[PDB]
Amino acid sequence: KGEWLPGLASPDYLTGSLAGDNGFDPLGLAEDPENLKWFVQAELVNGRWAMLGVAGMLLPEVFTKIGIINVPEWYDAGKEQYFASSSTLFVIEFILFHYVEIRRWQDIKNPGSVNQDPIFKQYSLPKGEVGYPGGIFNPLNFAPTQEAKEKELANGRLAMLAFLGFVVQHNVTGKGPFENLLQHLSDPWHNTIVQT
Amino acid sequence: DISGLTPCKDSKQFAKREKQQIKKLESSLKLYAPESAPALALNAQIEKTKRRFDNYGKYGLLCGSDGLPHLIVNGDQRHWGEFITPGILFLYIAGWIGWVGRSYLIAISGEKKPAMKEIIIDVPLASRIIFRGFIWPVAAYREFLNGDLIAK
Amino acid sequence: PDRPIWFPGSTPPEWLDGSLPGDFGFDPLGLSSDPDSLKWNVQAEIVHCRWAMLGAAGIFIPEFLTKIGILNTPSWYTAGEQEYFTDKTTLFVVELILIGWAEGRRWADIIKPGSVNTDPVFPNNKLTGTDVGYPGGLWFDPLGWGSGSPAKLKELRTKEIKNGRLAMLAVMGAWFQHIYTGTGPIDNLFAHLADPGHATI
Amino acid sequence: MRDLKTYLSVAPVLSTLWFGSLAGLLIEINRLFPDALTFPF
Ligand code: CLA
Ligand SMILES: CC(/C=C/C=C(C)/C=C/[C@@]12O[C@]1(C)C[C@@H](O)CC2(C)C)=C\C=C\C=C(C)\C=C\C=C(C)\C=C\[C@@]12O[C@]1(C)C[C@@H](O)CC2(C)C
Ligand SMILES: CC(/C=C/C=C(C)/C=C/[C@@]12O[C@]1(C)C[C@@H](O)CC2(C)C)=C\C=C\C=C(C)\C=C\C=C(C)\C=C\[C@@]12O[C@]1(C)C[C@@H](O)CC2(C)C
Ligand SMILES: CC1=C(\C=C/C(C)=C/C=C/C(C)=C/C=C/C=C(C)/C=C\C=C(C)\C=C\C2=C(C)CCCC2(C)C)C(C)(C)CCC1
């Protein structure tokens, strides 16, 4: 589709048949079709996790402007006490995610081989793409046209960049992400990465 | 106290070594006027020696019976900066260099006279290849998985 | 072939055939023997000329008015040490970003001509230029004097090139005069006019 | 000149330039951060 840099010719292996294809591959990671097949799924999963992470880091902090709830900032939520110890929660999360990710992994190797429920054999997911399961995972039956996939990928890339910014800003500033925006909005021409 | 060693900041021999070096440096200073340039150089050397000893004291090194720092390379988390991290950095840099060299060698293998491109470097091709080595681990791992790394 | 030459009685280099504007066959070291270097050097000379003309105007006109007392602007040499509304590194970063966007599209036109002539946002707007280095269009050529017969274009481009060379020389001269004499460029001219025999290096 | 650029790509000249830049970078790095024995970060 569009060009990430006008005046430069798109690589041949990027034929534009994929959603969100702008011909951006200066270092040639996706020359091998198997590598491209793996990296598409990797990007999809990374973005889908990153958007949720950013939503969970930003929104539970914007409460200060509204004063509705009281929750510690994203880097202090770990130290708080909970009804169960860290070890038990970590073990349960490991046990569940092992099964979930092993089930997801098998579809990349042999598509259409994990479409049937293992206990109740009369329940199955309708056939679809590798990274787009559908069925019960799409309860509202929104049509997955190419435009929506491009929107999803753009939002995922933006959220990856946002999470990287969130991580980097806290390391050097020592505060959360929302107050950094307010500090910049206070005096824009003096509060930047150049402190002076 | 691994293997009977002691911290640098608690070692008396370390302070004795620092005092001896400072005293040796200060002896030559008395031969020159305070405003003379050699006096400034000697003052800078003394300040650098003091700063080096203070920095060695701050980093939590271990001293032996002779007042000299010793390096632990067994993998203890308290001493991961002596061997582990610089080793990983060196491995990354060496892999970058090797991958760049291998890619350049492979690229020119199909030319009519490949031996001519080895003594007279094709600068644009090398420059286009140089930046590619920044992600060498991923490329190497995927090449190994696809069976391309080893010649048949 | 019959054009005036920088060194009358000599033979101009083969790669300089007089087609380019402002061509006098001056290339003793042959720095533009192959065509790619010729095109790159032509673009570099055009850019240097325009930047130098802007700099010469901005150095000499403000300093002239300050001497006669209409304005009280500081010296161009020390104009970088004043304090402004923000730190100088912030201004440098803003300049770098803006001029990177501006010069980035210029780099693409040199490598692949005719590829950056369309507005990314409003496709209805286009640049009408056809030559590399002369973008044209309403943004850069509002008065419409940039298109016409080849003779007019050659005359205008020769005028621009010669004026740019003069501006480059003038700017370098002003810089070295302020380095050596330690006085404003306008003061040097008045000193020379006072005693032309002795007001000299 | 094409022939002048070709002579700059010969192995000894390129090696000399690369190693000179490398040595300058290393000398400057050691000047900024002298007496390094452990990685503190
Ligand atoms: C357009 C170019 C130009 C012009 C008009 C002037 C003019 C002047 N310079 Mg000067 N200068 C220039 C370039 C120029 N310079 C350059 C490039 C340098 C760096 C080497 C210097 C270094 C310099 C010093 C160190 C001093 C002057 C001084 C002076 C003034 C006294 C005359 C003199 O001794 O000149 C000497 C000029 C030179 C040694 C440079 C050679 C001349 C260049 C190559 C241009 C040649 C003129 C041009 C070909 C003729 C057509 C243009 C014409 C319409 C002006 C006078 C106003 C003196 C001063 O302050 O006066 C009180 C002084 O001490 N200049
Ligand atoms: C998944 C992710 C983040 C996920 C976060 C999650 C789940 C949760 C976060 C938490 O906050 C909560 C919710 C609650 C808190 O209490 C705890 C934590 C745990 C803190 C980020 C991904 C982030 C992913 C990023 C930033 C990826 C960047 C990739 C880039 C830039 C690649 C560029 C190129 O590869 C191309 C495209 C083409 C090549 O040719 C050239 C180059 C240039 C190499
Ligand atoms: C190009 C140049 C010199 C040219 C050199 C020449 C002739 C070389 C000639 C040859 O190559 C040929 C032809 C052919 C070869 O075979 C032989 C040689 C002999 C090698 C000078 C200036 C080149 C470049 C110049 C003039 C730069 C201009 C600077 C500007 C715009 C400054 C602006 C400001 O001054 C303001 C306006 C206001 C201030 O407050 C702030 C600042 C920022 C200071
Ligand atoms: C444990 C340990 C140890 C010991 C031992 C060891 C470490 C061993 C081994 C190791 C190894 C054994 C590694 C690796 C492997 C590999 C494989 C399995 C295969 C293959 C490979 C290759 C062949 C490579 C190559 C290359 C690259 C990739 C880069 C560039 C260059 C080149 C091309 C060469 C120590 C104590 C010391 C430390 C700690 C840890």
Short mmCIF file of N, CA and C in Angstrom, two decimals, chain C residues 25-100:
data_model
loop_
_atom_site.label_atom_id
_atom_site.label_comp_id
_atom_site.label_asym_id
_atom_site.label_seq_id
_atom_site.Cartn_x
_atom_site.Cartn_y
_atom_site.Cartn_z
N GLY C 25 34.15 26.51 -17.60
CA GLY C 25 35.20 25.52 -17.78
C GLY C 25 36.29 25.55 -16.73
N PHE C 26 35.95 25.88 -15.49
CA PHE C 26 36.92 25.94 -14.40
C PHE C 26 36.79 24.66 -13.57
N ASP C 27 37.74 23.75 -13.75
CA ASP C 27 37.79 22.51 -12.99
C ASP C 27 39.21 21.94 -13.05
N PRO C 28 40.19 22.61 -12.43
CA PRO C 28 41.58 22.15 -12.56
C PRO C 28 41.82 20.76 -11.99
N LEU C 29 41.14 20.40 -10.91
CA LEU C 29 41.37 19.11 -10.26
C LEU C 29 40.45 18.00 -10.76
N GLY C 30 39.49 18.32 -11.62
CA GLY C 30 38.60 17.31 -12.16
C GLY C 30 37.76 16.62 -11.11
N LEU C 31 37.18 17.40 -10.20
CA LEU C 31 36.39 16.83 -9.11
C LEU C 31 35.03 16.31 -9.57
N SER C 32 34.62 16.60 -10.80
CA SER C 32 33.33 16.18 -11.33
C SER C 32 33.50 15.51 -12.69
N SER C 33 34.45 14.58 -12.77
CA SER C 33 34.70 13.88 -14.03
C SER C 33 33.53 12.98 -14.41
N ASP C 34 33.03 12.17 -13.46
CA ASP C 34 31.91 11.29 -13.77
C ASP C 34 30.58 12.01 -13.54
N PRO C 35 29.56 11.66 -14.33
CA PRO C 35 28.31 12.45 -14.31
C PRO C 35 27.63 12.53 -12.95
N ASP C 36 27.67 11.45 -12.16
CA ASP C 36 26.99 11.46 -10.87
C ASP C 36 27.58 12.53 -9.96
N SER C 37 28.91 12.62 -9.91
CA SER C 37 29.56 13.67 -9.15
C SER C 37 29.21 15.05 -9.71
N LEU C 38 29.05 15.16 -11.03
CA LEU C 38 28.66 16.44 -11.62
C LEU C 38 27.30 16.88 -11.12
N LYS C 39 26.32 15.97 -11.12
CA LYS C 39 24.98 16.31 -10.66
C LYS C 39 24.99 16.65 -9.17
N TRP C 40 25.69 15.84 -8.37
CA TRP C 40 25.76 16.08 -6.94
C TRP C 40 26.40 17.43 -6.64
N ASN C 41 27.49 17.76 -7.35
CA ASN C 41 28.16 19.03 -7.15
C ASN C 41 27.30 20.20 -7.59
N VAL C 42 26.53 20.04 -8.67
CA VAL C 42 25.63 21.11 -9.10
C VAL C 42 24.59 21.39 -8.03
N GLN C 43 23.99 20.33 -7.48
CA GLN C 43 23.00 20.52 -6.43
C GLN C 43 23.62 21.17 -5.20
N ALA C 44 24.81 20.71 -4.81
CA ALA C 44 25.49 21.28 -3.65
C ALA C 44 25.81 22.75 -3.86
N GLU C 45 26.27 23.10 -5.07
CA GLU C 45 26.58 24.50 -5.36
C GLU C 45 25.33 25.36 -5.30
N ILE C 46 24.21 24.87 -5.82
CA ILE C 46 22.97 25.65 -5.78
C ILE C 46 22.54 25.90 -4.34
N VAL C 47 22.58 24.84 -3.52
CA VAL C 47 22.17 24.98 -2.12
C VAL C 47 23.10 25.93 -1.37
N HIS C 48 24.41 25.77 -1.57
CA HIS C 48 25.38 26.65 -0.93
C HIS C 48 25.16 28.09 -1.36
N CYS C 49 24.89 28.31 -2.65
CA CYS C 49 24.66 29.66 -3.14
C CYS C 49 23.47 30.31 -2.45
N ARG C 50 22.34 29.60 -2.39
CA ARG C 50 21.14 30.21 -1.81
C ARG C 50 21.32 30.48 -0.32
N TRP C 51 21.87 29.50 0.41
CA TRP C 51 22.12 29.71 1.84
C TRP C 51 23.07 30.88 2.05
N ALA C 52 24.09 31.01 1.20
CA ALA C 52 25.07 32.07 1.36
C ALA C 52 24.46 33.44 1.08
N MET C 53 23.58 33.53 0.08
CA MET C 53 22.92 34.81 -0.19
C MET C 53 22.05 35.22 0.99
N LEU C 54 21.29 34.28 1.54
CA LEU C 54 20.49 34.62 2.72
C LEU C 54 21.38 35.07 3.87
N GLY C 55 22.48 34.35 4.11
CA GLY C 55 23.38 34.72 5.18
C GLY C 55 24.03 36.08 4.97
N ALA C 56 24.44 36.37 3.74
CA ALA C 56 25.07 37.65 3.45
C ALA C 56 24.10 38.80 3.69
N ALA C 57 22.85 38.65 3.23
CA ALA C 57 21.86 39.68 3.51
C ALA C 57 21.69 39.87 5.01
N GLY C 58 21.50 38.76 5.74
CA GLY C 58 21.23 38.85 7.16
C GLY C 58 22.43 39.31 7.98
N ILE C 59 23.63 39.23 7.41
CA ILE C 59 24.80 39.73 8.12
C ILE C 59 25.01 41.21 7.83
N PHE C 60 24.87 41.61 6.57
CA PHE C 60 25.30 42.94 6.18
C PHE C 60 24.21 44.00 6.34
N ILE C 61 22.96 43.70 6.00
CA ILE C 61 21.90 44.70 6.17
C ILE C 61 21.69 45.08 7.63
N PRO C 62 21.55 44.13 8.57
CA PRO C 62 21.43 44.54 9.98
C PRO C 62 22.61 45.33 10.51
N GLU C 63 23.84 44.97 10.11
CA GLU C 63 25.01 45.67 10.62
C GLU C 63 25.12 47.08 10.05
N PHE C 64 24.66 47.28 8.81
CA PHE C 64 24.68 48.61 8.22
C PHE C 64 23.76 49.55 8.99
N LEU C 65 22.54 49.10 9.29
CA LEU C 65 21.57 49.97 9.95
C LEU C 65 21.97 50.26 11.39
N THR C 66 22.63 49.31 12.06
CA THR C 66 23.07 49.54 13.43
C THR C 66 24.11 50.65 13.50
N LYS C 67 25.04 50.68 12.54
CA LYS C 67 26.08 51.70 12.55
C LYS C 67 25.50 53.10 12.42
N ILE C 68 24.52 53.28 11.52
CA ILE C 68 23.93 54.60 11.32
C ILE C 68 22.91 54.95 12.39
N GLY C 69 22.54 54.00 13.24
CA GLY C 69 21.75 54.29 14.43
C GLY C 69 20.26 54.07 14.32
N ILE C 70 19.77 53.49 13.22
CA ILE C 70 18.34 53.24 13.12
C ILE C 70 17.92 52.12 14.07
N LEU C 71 18.72 51.05 14.14
CA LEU C 71 18.48 49.96 15.08
C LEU C 71 19.69 49.79 15.99
N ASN C 72 19.51 48.98 17.02
CA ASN C 72 20.54 48.72 18.03
C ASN C 72 20.74 47.22 18.20
N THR C 73 20.85 46.51 17.08
CA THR C 73 21.03 45.06 17.13
C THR C 73 22.47 44.72 17.48
N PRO C 74 22.69 43.59 18.15
CA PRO C 74 24.07 43.21 18.51
C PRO C 74 24.86 42.71 17.31
N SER C 75 26.14 42.41 17.53
CA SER C 75 27.00 41.93 16.45
C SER C 75 26.59 40.53 16.02
N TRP C 76 26.76 40.25 14.73
CA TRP C 76 26.46 38.91 14.22
C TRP C 76 27.40 37.87 14.80
N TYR C 77 28.63 38.26 15.14
CA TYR C 77 29.58 37.32 15.74
C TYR C 77 29.09 36.83 17.09
N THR C 78 28.59 37.74 17.93
CA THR C 78 28.18 37.41 19.29
C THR C 78 26.67 37.24 19.42
N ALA C 79 25.94 37.18 18.31
CA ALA C 79 24.49 37.04 18.38
C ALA C 79 24.07 35.69 18.96
N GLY C 80 24.96 34.71 18.99
CA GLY C 80 24.66 33.42 19.55
C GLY C 80 24.83 33.29 21.04
N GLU C 81 25.35 34.32 21.71
CA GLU C 81 25.56 34.25 23.15
C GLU C 81 24.50 34.98 23.96
N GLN C 82 23.53 35.62 23.30
CA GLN C 82 22.44 36.24 24.02
C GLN C 82 21.50 35.18 24.60
N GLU C 83 20.68 35.60 25.54
CA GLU C 83 19.70 34.73 26.18
C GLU C 83 18.36 34.95 25.48
N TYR C 84 17.68 33.85 25.16
CA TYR C 84 16.37 33.89 24.53
C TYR C 84 15.33 33.25 25.46
N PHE C 85 14.10 33.13 24.97
CA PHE C 85 13.01 32.65 25.81
C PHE C 85 13.16 31.18 26.21
N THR C 86 14.08 30.44 25.59
CA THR C 86 14.29 29.05 25.94
C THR C 86 15.76 28.70 25.73
N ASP C 87 16.15 27.54 26.24
CA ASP C 87 17.53 27.09 26.11
C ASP C 87 17.87 26.82 24.65
N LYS C 88 19.14 27.03 24.30
CA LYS C 88 19.55 26.95 22.90
C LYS C 88 19.45 25.54 22.35
N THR C 89 19.62 24.52 23.20
CA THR C 89 19.51 23.14 22.71
C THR C 89 18.09 22.82 22.27
N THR C 90 17.09 23.39 22.95
CA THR C 90 15.71 23.19 22.53
C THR C 90 15.47 23.78 21.14
N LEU C 91 15.97 25.00 20.91
CA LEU C 91 15.85 25.60 19.58
C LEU C 91 16.59 24.77 18.54
N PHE C 92 17.76 24.25 18.90
CA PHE C 92 18.51 23.41 17.98
C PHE C 92 17.73 22.14 17.62
N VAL C 93 17.07 21.54 18.61
CA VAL C 93 16.29 20.33 18.34
C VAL C 93 15.09 20.64 17.44
N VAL C 94 14.39 21.74 17.72
CA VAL C 94 13.27 22.13 16.86
C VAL C 94 13.74 22.38 15.44
N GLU C 95 14.86 23.09 15.30
CA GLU C 95 15.44 23.34 13.98
C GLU C 95 15.81 22.04 13.29
N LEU C 96 16.42 21.11 14.03
CA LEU C 96 16.82 19.84 13.44
C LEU C 96 15.61 19.08 12.92
N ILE C 97 14.53 19.03 13.70
CA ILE C 97 13.34 18.30 13.27
C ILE C 97 12.73 18.95 12.03
N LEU C 98 12.55 20.27 12.06
CA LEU C 98 11.90 20.95 10.95
C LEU C 98 12.73 20.87 9.67
N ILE C 99 14.03 21.17 9.76
CA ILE C 99 14.89 21.11 8.59
C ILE C 99 15.14 19.67 8.16
N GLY C 100 15.00 18.69 9.05
CA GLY C 100 15.06 17.30 8.62
C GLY C 100 13.87 16.91 7.79
#
